Amino acid sequence: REKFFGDQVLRINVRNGDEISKLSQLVNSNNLKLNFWKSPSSFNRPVDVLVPSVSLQAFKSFLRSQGLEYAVTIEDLQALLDNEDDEMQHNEGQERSSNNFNYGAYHSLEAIYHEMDNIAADFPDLARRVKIGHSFENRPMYVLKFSTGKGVRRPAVWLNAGIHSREWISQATAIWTARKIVSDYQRDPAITSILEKMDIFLLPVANPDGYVYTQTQNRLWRKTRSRNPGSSCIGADPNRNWNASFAGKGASDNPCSEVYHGPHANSEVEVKSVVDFIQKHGNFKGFIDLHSYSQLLMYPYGYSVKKAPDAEELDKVARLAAKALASVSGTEYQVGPTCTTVYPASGSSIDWAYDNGIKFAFTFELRDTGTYGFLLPANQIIPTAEETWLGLKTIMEHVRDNLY
Numbered sequence: 001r002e003k004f005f006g007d008q009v010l011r012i013n014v015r016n017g018d019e020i021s022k023l024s025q026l027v028n029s030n031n032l033k034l035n036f037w038k039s040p041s042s043f044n045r046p047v048d049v050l051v052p053s054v055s056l057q058a059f060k061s062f063l064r065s066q067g068l069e070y071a072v073t074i075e076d077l078q079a080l081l082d083n084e085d086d087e088m089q090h091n092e093g094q095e096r097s098s099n100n101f102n103y104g105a106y107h108s109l110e111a112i113y114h115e116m117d118n119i120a121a122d123f124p125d126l127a128r129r130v131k132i133g134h135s136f137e138n139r140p141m142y143v144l145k146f147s148t149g150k151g152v153r154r155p156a157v158w159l160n161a162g163i164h165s166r167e168w169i170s171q172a173t174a175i176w177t178a179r180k181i182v183s184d185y186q187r188d189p190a191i192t193s194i195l196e197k198m199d200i201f202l203l204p205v206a207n208p209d210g211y212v213y214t215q216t217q218n219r220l221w222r223k224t225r226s227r228n229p230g231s232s233c234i235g236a237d238p239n240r241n242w243n244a245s246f247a248g249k250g251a252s253d254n255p256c257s258e259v260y261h262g263p264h265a266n267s268e269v270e271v272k273s274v275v276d277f278i279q280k281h282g283n284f285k286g287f288i289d290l291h292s293y294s295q296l297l298m299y300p301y302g303y304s305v306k307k308a309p310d311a312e313e314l315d316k317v318a319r320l321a322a323k324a325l326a327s328v329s330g331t332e333y334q335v336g337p338t339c340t341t342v343y344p345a346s347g348s349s350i351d352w353a354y355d356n357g358i359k360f361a362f363t364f365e366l367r368d369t370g371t372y373g374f375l376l377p378a379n380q381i382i383p384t385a386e387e388t389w390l391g392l393k394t395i396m397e398h399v400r401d402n403l404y
Ligand SMILES: *[C@@H]1O[C@H](CO)[C@@H](O)[C@H](O)[C@H]1NC(C)=O
Pocket: 243, 265, 266
C-alpha cells in the first residue's frame, strides 16, 4: 500500500507564464514524481503540489533557483493518513456493534451501497436504488432516485459525487444528502415542494473502482482504473472524458497523466453510463457535480472563455447558493465560470450537461481551501454536508421555479 512518509504539500506563488510553464514542465515530465493537488491557474491562485520525501531536496533547491516562493502546508502527509485510518477503523467497530450508520464518518463502497439500499428500504415510496451501469472493474454503478411521481418520468436534477476518487468529502456529503432528502420529505416545505414537481437522482460514488483503490492501494489516486490499451499506465480523468470539446485545453493525451482525457469521448464506462442514463431520460433540468477541494461554486464554460448564454442567471443562482451555504458556519465560497475561476479545462461533466440542454449545470468544490485538502478530517463531514445542503436546496428551488 502507498505510504507517504516525509511527503510534503508545498504551496507555490506564481505570477506569469515563465513561472507557470517551468513548474508545469518540471513534473508533467515526471522528474521528482510530484502530484499536483491544486492545478496552476494564472496570475491569481496558489498552486499546491505533493512532493515525495525522497525528492524534497531537489524540488526546494530548484524553487529557490527559479525565484519561486513556497510554504510547506502539510509537513507530513502520512500523519494525516494515519489519523484518517484510525478514525475509520474505530467507526467501523462501533457500526458493526451498533447496527447504526454513523453519517459523521468515511465509508467503504460496500457501506455506502448498503446504506443506499437501506434508505430505499426504509422509505419504499420515495427512494429506490437504480443500477445505471457498470464500473470498469465491473462493479454496479448505483444511483438513488427520489420521486413522488409513482413511476412516471418527471423533470429531473442530477447530483453526482466522487468522480475523482480521492475527493472523499464528496461521496460522504452525497450519502448524507440521500438521508437528508428522505428524512426531510413531508417536514421541510422546500424539499417537499421540490419533490412534488421533480425527480432527484443521486450518484454518491461516480468512480467506484478509484474509490476502492483509494481505500486499499493509494489514497491519492484520482482517475478511473481503465487499462489503457497501448500503455502500462492506468485510468483516465473521468472529468476530462466527457463529449464536450474533448481533447481540448487542460487535458493530456498521455495515459500516465493525471489529466488524461482517454482514447475517445465517453470512453470511460462510468461516464458513458451517466451520459446514457441522462439522454435516455431526456428531461434533466439540473446537473450538479460535487468535488473537493477549494471552496468554489462554478458554472459553464470551462473549455473556453466562450461565455454561456445563461451566465447571468447561473451567476445569480450560484451567488445566492453560496450566500445561503455561508449562513450555516461562515464558510466562504468563490463564484464564477470554470475557465477563469480555475483554469481552461475540456470535457467536464458540467460543460457536457449544459451543451446537452441542461441549463443549471454547477460544479461544487467543497472544503477546504488547502489546510487538509483531500484529507479533510471526518469531523468536518456533517458541517460540510449541512452547509452544502442549503447551497443545493437553493439551486433546486430555482430549477423548480424556472421549469423549461
Ligand atoms: C459528441 O456530441 C455531438 C453532439 O451531440 C455528437 O454529434 C457526437 O456524436 C458526439 N461524439 C461522440 C463520439 O459521442
